[PDB]
Amino acid sequence: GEAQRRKEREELAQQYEAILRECGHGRFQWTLYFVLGLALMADGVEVFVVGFVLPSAEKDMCLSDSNKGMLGLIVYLGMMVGAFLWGGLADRLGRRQCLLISLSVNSVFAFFSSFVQGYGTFLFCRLLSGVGIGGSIPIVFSYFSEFLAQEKRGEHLSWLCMFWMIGGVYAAAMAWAIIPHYGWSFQMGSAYQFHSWRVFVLVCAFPSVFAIGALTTQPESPRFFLENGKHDEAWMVLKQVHDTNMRAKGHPERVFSVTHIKTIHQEQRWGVRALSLGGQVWGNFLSCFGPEYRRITLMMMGVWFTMSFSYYGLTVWFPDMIRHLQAVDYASRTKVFPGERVEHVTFNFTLENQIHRGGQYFNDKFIGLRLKSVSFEDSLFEECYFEDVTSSNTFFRNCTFINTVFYNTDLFEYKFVNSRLINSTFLHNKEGCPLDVTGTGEGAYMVYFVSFLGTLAVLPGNIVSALLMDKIGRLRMLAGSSVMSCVSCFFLSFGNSESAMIALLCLFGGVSIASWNALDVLTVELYPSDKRTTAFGFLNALCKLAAVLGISIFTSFVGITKAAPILFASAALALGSSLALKLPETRGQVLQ
Amino acid sequence: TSILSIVYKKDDLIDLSRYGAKINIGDRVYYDSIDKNQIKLINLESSTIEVILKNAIVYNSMYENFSTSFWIKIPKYFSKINLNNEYTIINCIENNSGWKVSLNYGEIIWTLQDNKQNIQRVVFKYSQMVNISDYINRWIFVTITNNRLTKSKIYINGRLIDQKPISNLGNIHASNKIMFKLDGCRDPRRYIMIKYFNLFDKELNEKEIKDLYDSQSNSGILKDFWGNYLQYDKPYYMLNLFDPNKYVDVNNIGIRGYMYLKGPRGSVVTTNIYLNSTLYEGTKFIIKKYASGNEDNIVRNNDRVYINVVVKNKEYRLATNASQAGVEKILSALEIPDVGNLSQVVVMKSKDDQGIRNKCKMNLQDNNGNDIGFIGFHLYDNIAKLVASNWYNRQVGKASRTFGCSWEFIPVDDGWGESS
Ligand SMILES: *[C@@H]1O[C@H](CO[C@@H]2O[C@@H](C)[C@@H](O)[C@@H](O)[C@@H]2O)[C@@H](O[C@@H]2O[C@H](CO)[C@@H](O)[C@H](O)[C@H]2NC(C)=O)[C@H](O)[C@H]1NC(C)=O
């Protein structure tokens, strides 16, 4: 029984490869390449939106700690759910069908989140958008693989990763050209406010809609039709491929010589259908852990987990380290004024990064002052008057206030730490958040630039892989790029300034891309066409879970030491390369 | 049934009961100008009151039940000197045996002690961190009952607060003379107000305590936030009981303008001494007599008055157009001579139809004696606008819960000590 099924599958794969060789490479392949490139660009854009809008949403929504981190991680949680779900569903519903469904869900919820005012609703909308876009990568790669002959499969598949970098560049450019315009205050509804980061979210949800629009005009992959017992539509799709290719070539007169293609033999209602779909998906997932695929699946799991953990940890750790260095410089530039006795006089100033200690102000009226990271310590205020005072990161510690009036000030109760107020009156307090939210100004600009640089770092290595995938092999490229990634992780210690961190981030991003391309091609080529998307989606869910763990750990390791992240990344990459070197070779084989 | 009852008279304090208690008063004891029956005691040796009963009415038994009642006003405690400073205000202990009532930071304590030096203490506690307090600087009706067989109980405003068994206590002796002075107060600027001190030789139950509370409450006269009499030509700040976190404010002057509820209120803080809400915010309301024939300035029930409103230290008049859309019609503050024929007359109500005392309410009526309705607030497009409506009267007729027809008048007082 098993032998007959294996023979049928092998013969079907061989005939399919022969048909694809007969049709050739041409206009149809490039058109589908661009369509799925848009589908992948949507995914590439999706991972930057929350990170780019957090500085503004934290003030526009009164975001505290333990809520910004969840906002950051919700996209990866949504991707982890969506990758598995759509990878499981694509082997039973179709690659194009599930791609349309998931992309439409992503577009709908990304459009909805652009107008949502609350936090829990924003978290839910972003989680559902991540669920929608989670399954873009596995479905796109398995869908593009089934239209390529064995002569050039790694090259044509690795050309498909340029669009992830293009999406990253697009997100960086949109953030640079949209977010800095803080003056935009469109008003629709008195209780609601429309800022520029919502416009950024809209423009970032645009590429998923464009991808759906491009995907409406592409046919289903013939291989899914053949596996599922449908031979007429598979033959029609192959004929359409042949006609398009040969019409582009310049010979629109030859005839599709293929007549018959052997097909795999096939052997309350809503609830029954859902139960059947769940059972079949669970069966596919369990067969992925079968006697034939049990070593391969475990090694693939290890490689995906290790490389995702290391890459995501590093790519989140680099901006955090840059920010920590900038904060250290800022705190090193702080000025100190120990002791000052001040008599009756009106006070006007805008102070940045100062500490006044041991002050004694008597009958001083502070009118219209902006305070930025200004701290008063050991001070005594008597018969003072604060009017039109606005302050951020300002604290009054060990201070005593007597007969003082705070009129039209945002000096809330959390800014008076270990302070004693006697007979003091708070009048007409300005509207503000109950707790500190910090402030981000011009320093956001460079951040976008940094991200842009990182994405540009991917540009060279990709090309090399695209020019060398079929010359050396997937295993050799994977190992030889993981080794360089480990070398860069060790080299990490030779940098303590912002420029050094930028150069190191660019180097790591430019080195790991070849390994990622090889991993994608290898996981495409190592699984049969009836389990390709299920396995790819499961491995992508594992990748997203590893990304979450790595992000959490490497954020917890910022500002403590530079040895723990280096050790973790180097160990994980070494283990991943070791596990990868034992995989089987798939170059020069039919897509079986 | 009353043995001692101090009541003001012509420049003296007289016992109403048929016992002729001898009362002597110090030279630094004050009397309020409007309500001379209220007695003010300061933290001075001279500010003293002695009362002397007869030898036939001295509490000297073991099975004798007895009760005391009075009205007390205690200002706010401002600084840290006041905690852990229990000071006696009324005393009747001699040879270490008797009864006394004292005050501590947010506490009113009643103490009994017998010949065996056994202490029984019944305490009422009120916080000082509340936004709006019911006891800080406001008149409080305190009644203490003692049944030697069962319990000693305290009652604040006619409701039970604390009770403690005293059956273990032995024979309680009482002084021939009763004290009224502040003893043991370290604060040298601390004073109290007491009035209507009554003594009974039996334990009162809930019914007698309650009807005594109504009898001594003077339900026929309006009261301000502090419990004093409501007076004409005196600026009052406005507080709404239903919405106590917003103050009455105006934006424009005239018919095109409206008065609304603007918030939130400020705060007055002294770092774990008090965290009160600011009471001197908004626009002051002055009451002008129109048809009240009484010579005094006291505002009584069913008085038909005018309501001036103080905006930027200028006096305007409350008025509204009787003929506009809807029953809930907006109120406005407009110039005094230009009012013309818009409705001005407001009837002050203190007690309900049955005579049960409630808070201050204002019923706007026109020149023809037709009730425009009670004054309250209604929400128009997220603005709490002051309106005169018949809806509150309809709810009162149906015995339903009215929403926002109850107001409080807060004059500036020294016991609050807020900076304006
Ligand atoms: C805290 O203030 C109270 C009340 O004073 C008012 O509020 C102050 C903030 C300030 O604006 C004063 O001008 C106000 O009159 C003080 O208690 C009163 O103090 C005054 C002294 O000016 C005195 O004449 C009163 O008798 C005091 N009243 C009482 C009931 O004691 C209080 O002393 C202040 N606290 C401290 C530590 O100074």
Ligand SMILES: CCC[C@@H]1CC(=O)N([C@@H](CC)C(N)=O)C1
């Ligand atoms: C710099 C390369 C790492 C990124 C991380 C990631 O998830 N990448 C996708 C590319 C479509 C992938 N699954 O390879 C590339």
Ligand SMILES: *[C@@H]1O[C@H](CO)[C@@H](O)[C@H](O)[C@H]1NC(C)=O
């Ligand atoms: C300084 O004071 C003047 C007048 O008091 C005012 O116009 C100006 O705005 C103040 N400075 C700042 C920075 O607000």
Ligand SMILES: *[C@@H]1O[C@H](CO)[C@@H](O)[C@H](O)[C@H]1NC(C)=O
């Ligand atoms: C500052 O705090 C210290 C204790 O931390 C205290 O001894 C000192 O008195 C404080 N300064 C002032 C001005 O009260």
